[PDB]
Amino acid sequence: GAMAPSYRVKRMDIAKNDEECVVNAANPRGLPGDGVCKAVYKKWPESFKNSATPVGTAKTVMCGTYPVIHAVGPNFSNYTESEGDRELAAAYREVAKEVTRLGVNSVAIPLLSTGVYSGGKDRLTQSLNHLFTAMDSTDADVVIYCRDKEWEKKISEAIQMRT
């Protein structure tokens, strides 16, 4: 575990993370996809061997010795708000299990279902709170990656609020 487990946020490409493993915002079919998933495919293409996994689950595939945790959030275009919320909470609990199993001291994580899977809604608070519910009981250093300047400020404030 980390000596004093923390949460941090950075506004940059998760493909350039400085952590011991990465969470992919994956699709269920293990396809190259777009956004985070496409950046992860360009950086760690070997990790997409048999990465396909259902919605609400996480599957780890090694790229050399570097773990890529493929986490499949719901597409809120397809799910009801209620069922989507349940599957989004579940994807993050499966990430917490994988981070713990791997014995890493740090993990880079994006906000699941906040991009093309958002169903055109702002889900920053919804996705971040599910991330906290899952990861609070882990002792890894968590580093959240985002691209928007306003999102960085909002995630930073939400972290600082609990400290």
Ligand SMILES: CCOC(=O)c1c(C)n[nH]c1C
């Ligand atoms: C805004 C959509 O892109 C991303 O979120 C993103 C991150 C984080 N890393 N790489 C990409 C393309």
Ligand SMILES: [Cl-]
């Ligand atoms: Cl960058």
Ligand SMILES: [Cl-]
């Ligand atoms: Cl998304």
Ligand SMILES: [Cl-]
């Ligand atoms: Cl963002």
